[PDB]
Write a protein that binds this DNA or RNA. Structure first.
Lengths: 426, 71, 71, 426
DNA sequence: ATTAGGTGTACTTATCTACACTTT
DNA sequence: AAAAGTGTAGATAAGTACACCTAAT
């Protein structure tokens, strides 16, 4: 049994049955009346099924070899969810802390970090990759993107301990020009007026890293605290296992290609009903899809889209993990979520989009409007983004040139057939 | 602002404010709600409309409306 | 019993119940509300109608409808 | 200064300024939030004007020489409102008791009444002659229909003292065959399905009297208490002086015939807005008017129509004081409230009713319906009412025969021209 | 140069005033 | 001897969509 602490307040209890190997969640009546559930699949009345609770908890864990690091510190079995969540319970995705009864370390301290300590990990002692090689074959999402969640006051980075938690996520690059890619993409998103997490490039030694501001975390100047806001990804919202993050959950094999049990665009838009403002949500989701289509992000999947949980309803979070995959040909280029049963970005035409919107029960002109708006604004936008960059070498410059060219190419390509969309017969 | 009982106009105003709260274009919100923006304009201004329309936009924007001895 | 969230139908039902609560015939209530009883029947059954009608009947019968981070 | 007590609870204070000769009413915050005002013209915030308060208080007093009786027991001047209300405060129209601070006499007991005590009052004074006042009166303010408000448990009558109050009104007849008239009229009302107070004929010695059940008062069997419910007449609702009870408040003089400052049907229906259910109220009022027209009641006036006061809004009371004036030719036969500027019942035709409904902004077919329904139902109804009568002599029988004949005559007369109404050009 | 708007046919629909119907 | 709740029909009137164009900032 573990107590659920939100901030300084206890919202309920998570009980685990060792013999039955089953999970249960029960909430305080105060929270039942005034509060909100962990996810839609774990209601306040305590009717949450063991399965949904388990999957929810699993979805909080790392999806990469980094997990195997948790096995390095932990002395339990891979099949043990409880101990793992108990280990990382104090700081995880979302605002929920899982605290053993009568255990609190309020008075703890900060652990300032000097650049050498950060650089020390890039040498990959006590850290992934090891084992620097993707993939078996065609990647992705692991393990080539080493990351560290840290507390950032605007000056110095430090490790969060006890009640304190990391306010930022620092992403270090090994694979070529990834920080620049995500930086340009995220800034491009923000410039276009999209709702997106704030990103800044930070330097450690000769290495560049991407500092991302957590929107589910807010630091208070003038005192010692870190404010958390609870969130859930689309897998946790739809009650899907982490394996279902991709629409095709059994892999890219052309044998299983026809089997999609995972998160799709329909399943995503279905969540608009649970949002405080369904229209706005669908708008955000559609712009997310179109944006990922234009920036050539094929890795946009279930856990890359999340919602703020509130008593009134769900709210969409700012976008995050926006990257152009089209740049890298050593990765998988087929979309995580297909457009009207088409996973090939190059096979997308007026038909796929027309049927895609028809499949959502939404007017096509909405997509025409939303698509035409962005693609036309990108050329002037991408320019402003490049100027936000720090000093570069020639390779990086060539990469950014290639990026700009590819982006403009996609923009033109899409902008080419948009008019056909209205008159298509699906 | 009115916590008072709603009429044809104040409903349109409520809708308009909830729309503007979401920073949504009339065309976009209308399209998503399954109506033309002109109709949405009619609704926002309190002009006469089919109840279905009103409920389409209301349900769209997630607005909930509810019905409000001896001595 | 009263369901809080209103839809097109439950509104008509609410109206019908409030009407029958006053023990008024459809023709009389409709006439007094300034509509034909057929229209009132349309409203009671939750069928599509002009919002003005709904508000005529609602205002007539004294039914009031109202708009309902961090850590 | 007098405290306002509703039941066992103090709802506020009525303050009187002796020097300024002005009235003021202020309420407790509990009552302000959860309660309701004395009338619409005396709001809970205490903004009620001295004028409206005065008129309201005056409206509670007797309109007949009985006023001079309360002056006989109290011994004060006519121009004194405070002392009179202070005198009768314990029992008045409505549920409001006006109690001097920290003063209660009664230790309430019952004072049983034997018929002899009644006959003593039916006998000379005990002043109720009351003619000839002044003045040769006409309209039913004339002479005396002596009544006493008394407690009736269903068996024995007793005087109400202290917190206890009269649950019934016993009306004794002097003028010929009035009890039978009001009985038949009220019972006819009740039979037709109208909302009306319940009446029963009671006998004292050889004298007949009409026992009327107060709808603003309810007795609890099994215990000693009397529950009051606050009400207001249309004069108190519209904030009019007692003099305005009749549409023509300056009398029937042909000089003042064109001057009507008093309660009319329009002014009455205007109150439908303040009711919890305006439609039902308008229905009640319309049926009231039509019923009074069919039964030939020309004395139906402002103080003969009242409303229950509740926090949610006003509600119409059951009808009362329904009498057929057409039977008596020694009285004023012109309506208290005119039909489209026509005070003569004999001059009422399709035109007057058409314009009457047009003046209310209501469909004519409504009046056609309500009129046609009743006028055909009266013939079968009046029969059933006669069977409710006690044993009669020949005079009474002749009176009831005349009554029935007149009633049927009116019914036919109205039913004659009712159809023309739709095609009338006003 | 974008959002909140007014146009324009062609279309679909609610409203009204009676009559007549199926059940008390 | 109905009453209240239904539908029917022509006739009036009015909403919706669909896309083009306006006026400002």
């Amino acid at each position: 049994t573990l107590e659920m602490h939100l901030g300084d307040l206890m919202i309920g209890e998570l009980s685990f049955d060792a013999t039955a190997d089953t999970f249960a969640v029960h909430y305080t009546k105060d929270w039942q009346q005034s509060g909100f559930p962990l996810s839609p699949t774990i209601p306040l009345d305590g009717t949450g099924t063991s399965n949904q609770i388990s999957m929810f908890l699993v979805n909080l864990l790392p999806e990469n070899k980094g997990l195997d690091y948790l096995i390095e510190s932990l002395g339990v079995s891979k099949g043990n969810t409880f101990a793992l969540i108990r280990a990382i319970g104090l700081d995880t995705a979302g605002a929920i802390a899982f605290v053993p009864k009568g255990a609190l370390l309020p008075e703890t301290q900060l652990r300032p970090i000097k650049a050498e300590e950060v650089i020390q990990r890039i040498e990959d002692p006590t850290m992934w990759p090891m084992e620097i090689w993707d993939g078996k074959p065609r990647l992705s999402v692991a393990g080539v993107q080493p990351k560290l969640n840290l507390f950032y006051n605007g000056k110095e980075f430090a490790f969060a301990e006890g009640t304190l938690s990391s306010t930022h996520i620092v992403k270090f690059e090994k694979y070529h020009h990834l920080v620049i890619n995500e930086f340009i993409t995220m800034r491009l998103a923000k410039v276009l007026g999209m709702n997106v997490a704030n990103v800044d490039i930070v330097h450690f030694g000769r290495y560049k890293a991407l500092c991302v501001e957590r929107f589910d975390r807010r630091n208070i100047p003038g005192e010692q605290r870190v404010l958390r806001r609870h969130i859930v990804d689309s897998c946790q919202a739809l009650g899907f296992s982490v394996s279902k993050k991709y629409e095709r959950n059994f892999g890219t094999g052309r044998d299983v290609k026809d089997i999609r049990e995972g998160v799709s665009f329909n399943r995503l838009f279905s969540l608009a009903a649970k949002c405080r403002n369904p229209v706005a949500a669908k708008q955000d989701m559609l712009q997310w899809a179109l944006f990922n289509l234009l920036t050539g992000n094929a890795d946009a999947h279930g856990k890359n889209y999340s919602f703020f949980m509130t008593p009134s309803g769900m709210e969409p979070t700012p976008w995050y993990d926006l990257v152009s995959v089209d740049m890298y040909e050593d990765f998988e280029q087929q979309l995580a979520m297909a457009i009207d049963d088409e996973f090939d970005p190059n096979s997308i035409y007026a038909y796929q989009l027309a049927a895609f919107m028809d499949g959502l029960g939404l007017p096509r002109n909405l997509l025409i409007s939303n698509l035409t708006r962005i693609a036309r604004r990108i050329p002037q936008a991408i320019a402003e983004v490049i100027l936000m960059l720090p000093p570069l070498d020639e390779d990086e410059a060539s990469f950014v040139a290639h990026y700009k060219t590819q982006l403009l190419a996609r923009c033109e390509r899409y902008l080419g057939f948009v008019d056909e969309v209205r008159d298509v017969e699906v | 602002i009115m916590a008072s009982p709603l009429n044809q106009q104040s409903l349109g105003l409520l809708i308009k404010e909830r729309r503007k709260s979401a920073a949504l274009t009339q065309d976009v919100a209308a399209m998503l709600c399954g109506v033309t923006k002109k109709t949405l304009i009619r609704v926002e201004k309190g002009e006469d409309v089919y109840i279905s329309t009103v409920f389409k936009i209301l349900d769209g924007l997630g607005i909930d409306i509810v019905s409000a001895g001896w001595y």
